[model samples]
Target chain A: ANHHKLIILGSGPAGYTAAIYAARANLKPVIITGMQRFDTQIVYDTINAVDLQNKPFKLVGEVEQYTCDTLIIATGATAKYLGLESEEKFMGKGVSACATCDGFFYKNKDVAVVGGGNTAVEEALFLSNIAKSVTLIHRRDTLRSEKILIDKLMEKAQHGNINIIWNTTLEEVLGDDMGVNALRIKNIKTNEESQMGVAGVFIAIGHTPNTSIFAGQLEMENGYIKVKSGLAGDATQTNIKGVFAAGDVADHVYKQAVTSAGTGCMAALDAEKYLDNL
Target chain B: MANHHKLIILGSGPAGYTAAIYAARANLKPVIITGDTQIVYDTINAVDLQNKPFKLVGEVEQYTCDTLIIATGATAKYLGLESEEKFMGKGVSACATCDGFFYKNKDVAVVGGGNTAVEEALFLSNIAKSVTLIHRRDTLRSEKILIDKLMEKAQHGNINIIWNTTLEEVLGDDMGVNALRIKNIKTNEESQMGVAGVFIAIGHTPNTSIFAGQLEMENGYIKVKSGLAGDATQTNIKGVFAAGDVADHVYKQAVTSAGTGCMAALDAEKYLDNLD
Candidate 1:
């Protein structure tokens, strides 16, 4: 067992930015990576494809440890996939978890959104702007999103481009070795199977907080770390001292990379102040 | 009147980070403009060309704006000379706070004795194999408490003080700076010592040249409308925010930046969130 002044787990935007700050502070912080990897995975996936061709992609992940006084966590959240191994194949190629990041690629092309929650509805609204048409496939007849968003989505449905596939589930993401060319969806009500040609499929399903390792060691709400407040919430101070959380794992709104990196910096500082007092 | 957010301050280091966190949590989502008009000032001051030319410089400076924020100031102070300007960031860094970690496993020199200098030397001592303090005076003119810590460090002898010495020049190669020229004013003897890098603790001048026309500035630093937590943190214009080294005149720490960064984001978020 290694006893470090501070140990940061995860290496996403939040984790890396936290390390950058803590290391600069002379904390000599050590980062513990459980699995997956840095936050650049999704970004890399999108750039490798023909999408975002002109955008420059330089991913520099450097952690120069200097201080030994504090630990910062930048490990980010993991979205809950359908758990189908086949779906993993389409990730980045066509299956994406973030609409804001990959939405532009689907512009003027049809895309399918899976899930019935507010996230799904919001993604649908987001896609409707860029994507030529959006197909909302939900597990239930009514959208489980906010009434306001649902109302707006209902209005969008009148545009003839938005289609609702109620009580339907993804059967297979059809694609070649290159990328996803289409999707095969099944209707739970009629056992009907159909294939729709589309450029992308967005898994608007909610994310599962990667807090399993810290279970029982920190305070949590609905599997996510419960900061005293929200994203800018109460310093993310758990019941435990010297421990804090930030990013999508702790934030409920505005989970942008910049925002997560911002919070990661906050968590590290909050931890630093705690260690300074200690 | 451009009705806006809670605050719009300047600078973007630790002070700004803390202010951003506080303001944003208050639901004040502040917008940050990272560049001042004197874009070429840093380029003009850079003494040595380092690294490969960034293939993309124009796209990197793009900034999106919103409302009010706390400024965390930033600056690249010099040894107050032209040649010293030549080595900026090549071997001379304005921020001992940000770049001191790079000196680890090597010999380096710090060129001041203020709280900032002593603190930087202390930071370097843990990382750099050796730290040489070069000051122009035999006695340090910083706070008594810091001078005490510096004296204690001096007693250890691992920290060497070339007191009454001033930096006459920076010596480097095509690769970068390799050593510095120091002069002992008392004896009038000059010598050059070998070092991998030099940490300029001479202090910084914040980036507020553009705001000189609109906002009131003090000593080149942006004057905060808010004092001790006031609303003047926002700029004269509505929907503008500052963070992380841009608004800070004191306590420029990474943690402080993180705190103020959170404040700026929340401030911007709140400003935009309330627009409905």
Candidate 2:
């Protein structure tokens, strides 16, 4: 097993920023990157298991094993999309998971949102003001969101900018080489097929954090590692001492890249303090 | 009184700029400036938070808004020495985590006796060849754990604490800080020590004087509701949010300030949505 002082997991903004700070602190940290950079060593393999019960936490990978005095987990979350071939094909071209990150592109254009939860309603409300029109497609007749958000959606729908298609599901994404230009819809109750013209489609279903490897070893709530949050000491410290968590893996409320980088810096400082004490 | 905006943000630093970016992207159509009107930028005289549509009195006029976001950042306290300003980036730094790496294996001096001073010294001790802590007072006001660790480092000969001492000037040439002139208050003695870097870690003063008794505060920093969940930046009053260094006494980094600023804008957006 290769032993190191600090090991950061993941390669997103959180992981890279953590490596930058840790390396600057002279911790000589290593990162488990999917592919890589920075002053840290990289192990390009998916982590299969993590044994935190041992003194030097052992991270088991497919081809190798590594140990670290302290661990910083920055494994981020992935946006979940419908497992449709056409939907997958139209990703990035016209399909987006985040409205805040991509909403500006569809200004004055028409867009479609697929989901019945708060995310879908919020995306529709956000797009209504920017886009020429917003068409919300849900398989269910009602929304499973808060009353306030639903009220806002209704108000926007009343303004004719937002159109809600009830009991409908997306059958296929239709577009040419340029990108997605429309979507094929199917009504479950009547088995009716219809086509709607839209410039973009937002899949606002939800997100899943990448934290399965440390399942039983660490305490998690809704698949997110719980950390000590507040203005006090080490807000990023996890249940296990000398172990910290940052980014989307431990945060779901403020999941911006900047926020993730902030937490990554905190985790690096926290890890340094832990090592200093030890 | 001039009234126009649904939200008003104060301050123009990293936090305020980031909040403006996020809020504008959300289609809020926010106005970012200082004036005597809505989205105004003037020296605020007082704030009446007793009712809705809070009233803010500036130097010239008054403004009212349904929601407010305070992002006025804190200013780092300096030793007030002309040499400190002259050697600004050359050798004098306020943050150790940011500039300590530059002095790897070289000697440096840190001035102060509070938590920030001790923490900076401890952080530098791990990187610098030797760290000299200069304090005007004989006792330290930091936590016991920190004091104990600093003592251990001193025992290991990595750190040296100079009690009853005050830094008179930072001496350097065109390159950067090369030495520091010091004086002992009790003995009425003056001396100079050669060092490569100097970190003034006295403390910071959050710009909250305009909100003296209007809002609840802790140790001069605005008290904000902090958590990973939603509504993380709401201050003591409803529809009034605080972000960045003004509300955060811990983790006072530019990135962290930006992060909190983003959250404050989101919270304000939600508040507006609920109001509608």
Candidate 3:
């Protein structure tokens, strides 16, 4: 069996940053990237199973097996989108998942954000500042976000910059060779359909954390790994010792790349201290 | 009774820049230090956070703000030795994580006696061929677990610890650090050890002196609401917030600073949305 001091899963910003920190700390960490720099060894394979029941936790992969003294799980989450054929067609052309990453591109242009959660409202608020207009389409009549965010959305709605279309769902994305141009929306209550012209559409429904492999093995909330959520020494530590989680896998709020990298650095430091105590 | 904006960000490091980027994108149009009137180049003398539109009396004029984000980062402390400053970037470094990769398979020396020094020495031991830890004190002032690890690595001959010794000077040519001149604190003896790199792992001082009584602080660091929730960057005050190294003493990397900066901007935006 191959062994290592530390093994990081995923190749996103969090995983790469964790490897950088762990390697700098002299851990000589081995990273299992879906994709290395410095002193890290990157393996291109998918991890199928992880057994955290024993020391030197075992990780079974499609191509190899690994036993590591400490494990860092930075497996990022995937944004949920409506399974529309046209939505998949214009994925990058005009449809987007993250507002912070793509909101700037839609400056002074009309856009639509779809969801009933905080992400939708937040994206609507953020776009109201840059875009010419923002139309927020939600399946439910009410939002499932904090009172503060809802209040802000209402304030923006009052200014005529934001339009809230309640009980409406995106039927299909209509676009041509250039990019997305309009959306086909349906009202569940009235059984009526209408076309709303927009330049871009943001799908902010939610996300699914990549933690299916460690299900029942680690304590999780809503499929996301449960981590010590305080500013203490074990903020990144999972239910099992020597097992840590960072990035979007454990964080639902503030899912920026820089924030993920920050947590990755913390996880590496936490793992280093844990190995030292051992 | 000055003027106010939606948000006012302090400092100008990675944290402040990232916060500005996010805040500007959110339509906050935040005013940084290089903006507005009263170009005060000196440090803030006092901060009055007792009221909304907080007031600050500095060397220039009194300033006020509706919301404030403190991104003032900590400053790394270094030895007063001239040779140490002369060899900076060439062989002398402050951050082990940021610069340790440059000395792969080479010998290095770390100076200090606290947790940072001990941790740096431990980190260098894995990458460098040999690590010589020179401390002025007889015993280290780090955590017990770290001391135990250091001793274990010492037993394996990867790390060498010199007790009751201090760095006198860094000796090197135009290329880089070739060796280090050290002094024995107990016997007043002097010696020279050849090494390729030197890590100054003394400590850092958070830039929170101006907000001493206006806000709650722990060990000179501004206390922030640390969590994964939506409002993790809030300070003790309702509208005021803290980010970057000023709020975080644990993870002080630039990437971490940028992350907290992004959080602070979002938190400020949420707070502003709830204001009216």
Candidate 4:
């Protein structure tokens, strides 16, 4: 049958969590893992468009269209990276986008955070607690984050073990097969290049929610779906009725797998209650 | 003279273990003070949640931490029947979402008159061939929507509602629970109903005796600042955080608890890393 009571979009932790919870609730759910290659060669149009206003919501993929009573969009977000060739080679080995996830790996060792925003300072602050020395490599002199966060970073810089390399841009991540060992930086003001040794480097720029398919339809804030989050529950309830959003797609903060899984569980329960009323 | 840690997590269940795992990963040096005889404490004398480096007095030693992640879980209430203790997990289960799958296509009985009992009945009705809901009171204490749903299922579905009744005992063999002995409070009469499983969905007491007035609570569970924003797991206090069943009354799954555990650690890290 082409119809389902619930359809979860995405193949990440949030989507799988929704399917597991929805299945347990006897929602008879279907999960569409979007646009994945069969042999690492090609893929496309797993979900090209969606009609959220339509009853038994319509979803268009490649050759067939699918409909569902409720939809849970758990399509996750991708962390931004410098995209340097050497950085790609040491991806997850030394270069990580998530400092909360990978910061401990460089415990008692030297680490560097790239970018000049809230993410970079927070990552540097978090790493300052564990790392021997944390260097915030920023291209600008001033940190562009909330005053509270910036104050914390400043406090650590003065009273704790954090240093700021101002007006510098990361050029290359130099390392061996074992992982990243050094970072080449160019002074943005002087155009002079220098290299610093570090056990790990974090890309603390930001993230992009994978919401191109749901764009122009779902209410979004800075590309991430904004859910109705409050104490009344249904924290994953989107602007559209019977539709929900979970994981990094709806989260700008706490974009963790377990947090997404928690929201995924809440979304499934919320959808279950919505279906009961319908 | 006293033990001090950056973070101290109470309880050793899903939430506490996960808090330790994530906090330790963040190099927070989580000092897990669990149970009554948990890691070190023989018994806790007192706690100070109002100040930084919150203090706790224990028999083993006094403990201080800049931040605390309260993962103290809840305990499910059970009837004081002799047979109920004997048939624990043999068919007498506490959680419907956890043990309901074991009773699929089988006849089951649920006890209590609260929201949990009615919700468990509805959950069981979908899987069990038949469901029997026993209540000591005639009216259910659940919300109107739940009452309406339970009413509809009682009339047209496989749910049988038995009111003014109390569970006298659980009737089962060495194999498992096969029936339940009940008593009508008004009539003082007894009856036995045949069932393969018995679910005691009376209620749960969150382990908050140590934190009764120190933290905020709702419906006997710790209350956290739950939302899709910063400090999602923060309690009313700045540095203290709570997770797992202590804070969650709904969707109390291991994953959900573990999820909140991680959230608590992250929030704790942010709170502790900053110099005040």
lDDT values for all models: 0.62, 0.85, 0.85, 0.83
Interface RMSD of each: 10.6, 5.7, 5.0, 6.8
**Collision count for each candidate, in order:** 76, 3, 0, 0
lDDT tens readout by residue for model 3, A76-182: 99866545356668877789878898789998999999887878899999999999999999987778687778888999899769999999988889999899999
- Model 4, B1-276: lDDT tens digits are 347877888878888888888888887778788762126535566898878779988876788888988888887799878999999989999899999998889999999998789899999999999999999998886645677789999999999999999999998898999988899999999999899999999987888877779888777888888876678888888988988988887667788888889888888887876645
Model 3 Cα shift for residue B192 (angstroms): 12
Query: What TM-score against the true chain A does chain A of each candidate get?
Result: 0.49, 0.61, 0.61, 0.57
lDDT of 4 by residue, A117-207 (tens): 7778788988998999999998887775666888888898898889899999889888999998999999989999999999988877677
Native interface contacts retained, candidate 1: 0.03
Off by over 4 Å in 2: A35-38, A81-149, A152-205, B33-41, B78-165, B168-181, B184-189, B192-201
lDDT string for model 2 (B183-218, tens) is 999998999999999999898989888788888998
True contacts kept of 4: 0.49
Candidate 3 colliding pairs: none
Q: For candidate 1, report its TM-score.
A: 0.41
Q: What TM-score fits each model?
A: 0.41, 0.64, 0.64, 0.63
What DockQ does every candidate get? Answer: 0.03, 0.22, 0.25, 0.22
